[PDB]
RNA sequence: AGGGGAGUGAAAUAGAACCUGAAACCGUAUGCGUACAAGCAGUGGGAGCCUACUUGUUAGGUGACUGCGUACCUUUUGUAU
């Protein structure tokens, strides 16, 4: 059993009991969230192709933690023009655990 | 008050030479050559964060194209049908179903043909 | 405005001297000016002019294959002179008389508000003996104290000359920095009145 | 009111800018003088 | 000449060219890669192997194959030049 959900502008293929990192969500740790924006759900040999959203299908999950990704370094250099800039970046994420799929 | 540069100059060279680890020859052990390699490696890293998004989309398209023709449809006729019916699944998820969930990809393809496109 | 005396009653000192505002940016300027005026500038280095030797061209201008040089005591060279060598000078600033007096009127007012100014009747000690002044200061319960009097006694100055955190000073010799540095300040009633006729 | 507690008002003291120390400072290399010419050299002053 | 023990010392990798003792440079040992392959030597992707341990959505080393990619400074209308 797997499904396709939408979160953080991106789409994810999701099966029950799977950990993944999505964009930061405005939810504390430990609570429960519902994804009503479900594009496809499959259960073995029965696949419900989702016209834009499957009717009534939803996915349950809980927040595990928040954090930041590894640092990336930005360097802007223009040769023999006496210019240089530097910057760093760490992107926020949220890790969720899937604990329910039903169409 | 006379200031001696020996101690802060050494820490500044060592930061550059640590980033140049794994490079070839003088690019990993002399500061002058290693500084340019570290700057150039940061230009490529900035630029290839953009190409990475282009190169993966071209890879997903080439694989939906191969998967659609096994079902009797070209890539461009599939996308026209998918937009026509309602379906709005990504190219990243479509390319994943083409390889692994071939029976789910078949249902989506024959849904796009049934849209008379 | 009342200043409490340790044994007598309050002595009704003028509002302006004790009890004005704290002009922090003016006390900083008066403190900085005092420290800059207390340093002697006695240092010097040698320019390329006054390092010994180096009066001839080491080699001809062209044809050798070396960079152009004009003397061996150049700032670029190892034994050469300093580029901007130092000479003795003075770090003396100007502070107006009325800016200096205003700063003392801010320090004195702030000490009373911080309960770190102690006012007593006449402070006198007989015979110069550091051991005897130590006993007398603990009756007031003081450790790190500056003593300000209308005129410093000879006996009082000879004692506490060796005592570690105790300094004895005159009213007209008490610099702004001392009134901030010591944990407590001890002034006689006659020394309070002397402050009134200078700071207004 | 301690000797390590007092400070001057904001805007009453600036840092003084030193030309010729790297790219990020905005005064590196030519030091605010432009490119070649008389008014870019030691003692390169135009008489009043 | 220089060394291997033994003694002195808190410490001889403090042993007389003797406190600390960096970098260029030169070696030995182990792991992985490398003899059909063309270029500023990197980066995006990425298999396999080796080690460690919380036994694989982990950490470290290597990098077959592959897309893109002609150093830095200065002076110039303009430089891989
Ligand atoms: Mg260049
Ligand atoms: Mg240096
Ligand atoms: Mg390498
Ligand atoms: Mg090295
Ligand atoms: Mg001589
Ligand atoms: Mg001379
Ligand atoms: Mg001469
Ligand atoms: Mg010199
Ligand atoms: Mg030198
Ligand atoms: Mg000298
Ligand atoms: Mg005067
Ligand atoms: Mg004393
Ligand atoms: Mg520079
Ligand atoms: Mg600029
Ligand atoms: Mg200018
Ligand atoms: Mg110039
Ligand atoms: Mg010109
Ligand atoms: Mg120039
Ligand atoms: Mg000019
Ligand atoms: Mg010219
Ligand atoms: Mg000149
Ligand atoms: Mg040692
Ligand atoms: Mg030696
Ligand atoms: Mg010693
Ligand atoms: Mg040694
Ligand atoms: Mg070494
Ligand atoms: Mg080997
Ligand atoms: Mg061949
Ligand atoms: Mg081969
Ligand atoms: Mg070759
Ligand atoms: Mg070649
Ligand atoms: Mg690579
Ligand atoms: Mg990579
Ligand atoms: Mg690894
Ligand atoms: Mg490559
Ligand atoms: Mg190429
Ligand atoms: Mg040049
Ligand atoms: Mg030219
Ligand atoms: Mg030309
Ligand atoms: Mg070339
Ligand atoms: Mg070249
Ligand atoms: Mg070009």
UniProtKB/Swiss-Prot annotation, chain A:
<dbReference type="GO" id="GO:0019843">
    <property type="term" value="F:rRNA binding"/>
</dbReference>
<dbReference type="GO" id="GO:0003735">
    <property type="term" value="F:structural constituent of ribosome"/>
</dbReference>
<keyword id="KW-0699">rRNA-binding</keyword>
<keyword id="KW-0694">RNA-binding</keyword>
<dbReference type="Pfam" id="PF00829">
    <property type="entry name" value="Ribosomal_L21p"/>
</dbReference>
<dbReference type="InterPro" id="IPR018258">
    <property type="entry name" value="Ribosomal_bL21_CS"/>
</dbReference>
<dbReference type="GO" id="GO:0005840">
    <property type="term" value="C:ribosome"/>
</dbReference>
<protein>
    <recommendedName>
        <fullName>Large ribosomal subunit protein bL21</fullName>
    </recommendedName>
</protein>
<comment type="subunit">
    <text>Part of the 50S ribosomal subunit. Contacts protein L20.</text>
</comment>
<comment type="function">
    <text>This protein binds to 23S rRNA in the presence of protein L20.</text>
</comment>
<dbReference type="InterPro" id="IPR028909">
    <property type="entry name" value="bL21-like"/>
</dbReference>
<keyword id="KW-0687">Ribonucleoprotein</keyword>
Curated annotation (Swiss-Prot), chain B:
<keyword id="KW-0694">RNA-binding</keyword>
<dbReference type="GO" id="GO:0022625">
    <property type="term" value="C:cytosolic large ribosomal subunit"/>
</dbReference>
<keyword id="KW-0687">Ribonucleoprotein</keyword>
<dbReference type="InterPro" id="IPR049946">
    <property type="entry name" value="RIBOSOMAL_L20_CS"/>
</dbReference>
<keyword id="KW-0689">Ribosomal protein</keyword>
<dbReference type="Pfam" id="PF00453">
    <property type="entry name" value="Ribosomal_L20"/>
</dbReference>
<dbReference type="GO" id="GO:0003735">
    <property type="term" value="F:structural constituent of ribosome"/>
</dbReference>
<dbReference type="GO" id="GO:0006412">
    <property type="term" value="P:translation"/>
</dbReference>
<dbReference type="GO" id="GO:0000027">
    <property type="term" value="P:ribosomal large subunit assembly"/>
</dbReference>
<dbReference type="InterPro" id="IPR005813">
    <property type="entry name" value="Ribosomal_bL20"/>
</dbReference>
<protein>
    <recommendedName>
        <fullName>Large ribosomal subunit protein bL20</fullName>
    </recommendedName>
</protein>
<dbReference type="InterPro" id="IPR035566">
    <property type="entry name" value="Ribosomal_protein_bL20_C"/>
</dbReference>
UniProtKB/Swiss-Prot annotation, chain C:
<keyword id="KW-0687">Ribonucleoprotein</keyword>
<comment type="function">
    <text>One of the primary rRNA binding proteins, this protein initially binds near the 5'-end of the 23S rRNA. It is important during the early stages of 50S assembly. It makes multiple contacts with different domains of the 23S rRNA in the assembled 50S subunit and ribosome.</text>
</comment>
<dbReference type="InterPro" id="IPR002136">
    <property type="entry name" value="Ribosomal_uL4"/>
</dbReference>
<dbReference type="GO" id="GO:0019843">
    <property type="term" value="F:rRNA binding"/>
</dbReference>
<dbReference type="GO" id="GO:0003735">
    <property type="term" value="F:structural constituent of ribosome"/>
</dbReference>
<protein>
    <recommendedName>
        <fullName>Large ribosomal subunit protein uL4</fullName>
    </recommendedName>
</protein>
<dbReference type="GO" id="GO:0006412">
    <property type="term" value="P:translation"/>
</dbReference>
<comment type="function">
    <text>The P.aeruginosa S10 leader is not regulated by the E.coli L4 protein. This and other data strongly suggest the S10 operon is regulated differently than in E.coli.</text>
</comment>
<dbReference type="GO" id="GO:1990904">
    <property type="term" value="C:ribonucleoprotein complex"/>
</dbReference>
<feature type="region of interest" description="Disordered">
    <location>
        <begin position="38"/>
        <end position="67"/>
    </location>
</feature>
<comment type="subunit">
    <text>Part of the 50S ribosomal subunit.</text>
</comment>
<dbReference type="InterPro" id="IPR013005">
    <property type="entry name" value="Ribosomal_uL4-like"/>
</dbReference>
UniProtKB/Swiss-Prot annotation, chain D:
<comment type="function">
    <text>Binds to the 23S rRNA.</text>
</comment>
<protein>
    <recommendedName>
        <fullName>Large ribosomal subunit protein uL15</fullName>
    </recommendedName>
</protein>
<feature type="compositionally biased region" description="Gly residues">
    <location>
        <begin position="21"/>
        <end position="31"/>
    </location>
</feature>
<comment type="subunit">
    <text>Part of the 50S ribosomal subunit.</text>
</comment>
<feature type="region of interest" description="Disordered">
    <location>
        <begin position="1"/>
        <end position="48"/>
    </location>
</feature>
<comment type="similarity">
    <text>Belongs to the universal ribosomal protein uL15 family.</text>
</comment>
């Amino acid at each position: 059993m797997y499904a396709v959900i939408v979160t953080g502008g991106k789409q994810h293929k999701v099966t029950e009991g799977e950990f993944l990192k999505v964009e930061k969500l405005d939810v504390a740790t430990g609570e429960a969230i519902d994804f009503d924006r479900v594009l496809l759900v499959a259960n073995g040999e029965d696949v419900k192709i989702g016209l834009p959203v499957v009717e009534g299908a939803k996915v349950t999950a809980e927040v595990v933690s928040h954090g930041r990704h590894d640092k990336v370094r930005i360097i802007k250099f223009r040769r023999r023009k006496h210019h240089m800039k530097r910057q760093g970046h760490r992107q926020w994420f949220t890790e969720i655990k899937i604990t329910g799929i039903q169409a | 008050a006379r200031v001696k540069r020996g101690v802060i100059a050494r820490r500044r060279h060592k930061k550059i030479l640590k980033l140049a680890k794994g490079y070839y020859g003088a690019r990993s052990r002399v500061f002058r050559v290693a500084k340019q390699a570290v700057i150039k490696a940061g230009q490529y890293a900035y630029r290839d964060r953009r190409q990475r998004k282009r190169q993966f989309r071209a890879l997903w398209i080439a694989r939906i194209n191969a998967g659609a023709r096994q079902n009797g449809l070209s890539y461009s006729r599939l996308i026209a049908g998918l937009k026509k019916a309602a379906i709005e699944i990504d190219r990243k998820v479509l390319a994943d179903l083409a390889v692994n969930e071939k029976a789910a990809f078949t249902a989506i393809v024959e849904k796009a043909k049934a849209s008379l496109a | 405005m009342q200043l409490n005396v340790n044994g007598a009653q309050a002595i009704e000192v003028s509002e302006r001297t004790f009890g004005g505002e704290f002009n922090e940016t003016l006390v900083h300027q008066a403190v900085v000016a005092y420290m800059a005026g207390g340093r002697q500038g006695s240092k010097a280095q040698k320019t390329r002019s006054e390092v010994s030797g180096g009066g001839k061209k080491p080699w001809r201008q062209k044809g050798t294959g070396r960079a152009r040089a004009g003397t061996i005591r150049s700032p670029i060279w190892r034994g050469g002179g300093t580029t901007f060598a130092a000479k003795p000078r003075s770090h003396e600033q100007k502070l107006n008389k009325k800016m200096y007096r205003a700063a003392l009127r801010s320090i004195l007012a702030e000490l009373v508000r911080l309960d770190r100014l102690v006012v007593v009747a006449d402070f006198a000690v007989d015979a110069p003996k550091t051991k005897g002044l130590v006993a007398k200061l603990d009756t007031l319960g003081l450790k790190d104290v500056l003593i300000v009097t209308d005129g410093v006694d000879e006996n009082l100055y000879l004692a506490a000359r060796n005592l570690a955190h105790v300094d004895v000073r005159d009213v007209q010799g008490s610099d702004p920095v001392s009134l901030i540095a010591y944990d407590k300040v001890l002034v006689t009633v006659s020394a309070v009145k002397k402050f009134e006729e200078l700071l207004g | 009111m301690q000797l390590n507690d007092l400070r001057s008002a904001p805007g009453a003291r600036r840092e003084k800018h030193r030309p010729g120390r790297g790219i990020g400072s905005g005064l590196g290399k030519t030091g605010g003088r432009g490119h070649k010419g008389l008014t870019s050299r030691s003692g390169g002053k135009v008489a009043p």
